[PDB]
Structure formats: structure tokens, C-alpha cells
Amino acid sequence: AIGIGTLIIFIAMVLVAAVAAAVLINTSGFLQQKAMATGKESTEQVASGLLCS
Amino acid sequence: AIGIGTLIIFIAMVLVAAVAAAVLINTSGFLQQKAMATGKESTEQVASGLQVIR
């Protein structure tokens, strides 16, 4: 009797961990974009300019 | 299930990192004005004066 249930709830544990992992993976992706963008943009700003002759 | 907590603590971690970032942005603002003014003022001081002709 006991065995049956153990299997079923095991399935849920798997799926719930999977769903949580998805958040972390995705979010890391979402941040990767903006992280890079900010650095490149900021550098180009500080480095560039014009000078009156 | 372990996943549940992992989610919840992430929410916290983000929020704390936000607050930490904020103080630097704010402080940089405060310092900006104070610095700029100090330079301007000091410059005008050295540059200016009067001379007795006769």
C-alpha cells in the first residue's frame, strides 16, 4: 500500500525543482543582456568627445 | 519540496542587492554637486582682485 504513494509524490518533487530551476536559468539570461549593454555603453560615453581647435 | 524555498530566498537576494546599489547612486548624486561647486568657487577666488592705480 505504502509503496504506491511514495512513487507519486516523488514525481511532484522532481517537477517542482524543475520549475524553480527554470526561474533561475531564465532570470540569469534576462540579466546577461543588460549587464553587458550597460558596460559597453558607459565606456563609449566616457571615452568619446570632440575638441575645439 | 526544496524548490519552494530557493525561489523565495532569490526574491530577497535581489531586493537586498537593489538597496545596496541605491545608496551608491544616491551618494554619487550628493557628492556631484559638492565637488562641482568647490571647484568653481575656488577658481573664481584665485582669478579675481583689485589694483590701486593712484
Using CA atoms, how far apart are residues B1 and A15, in angstroms rounded to an integer?
A: 10
Answer for the pair A16, B1: CB distance below 8 angstroms, yes or no.
yes
Residue B6: count of CB within 10 angstroms of its CB:
15
- CA torsion angle B38 B41 B47 B53 (round to 10): -150
- Documented resolution in Å: 3.1
Q: Are the beta carbons of B10 and A23 separated by less than 8 Å?
A: yes
Chain B residues interacting with chain A (CB cutoff of 8 angstroms): 1-4, 6-7, 10
- How was this structure obtained? cryo-EM
Q: Rounded to a whole number, what is the distance in Å from the CA of B3 to chain A's nearest CA?
A: 5
Using CA atoms, how far apart are residues B5 and B16, in angstroms rounded to an integer?
A: 17
Using CA atoms, how far apart are residues A42 and A48, in angstroms rounded to an integer?
A: 10
Burial class of residue A30 in the structure, from the number of CB atoms within 10 Å of its CB (0-12 exposed, 13-18 middle, 19+ buried): exposed
Answer for the pair A13, B1: CB distance below 8 angstroms, yes or no.
yes
Q: Which residue of B has its CA nearest to A14?
A: B1
Using CA atoms, how far apart are residues B51 and B24, in angstroms rounded to an integer?
A: 47
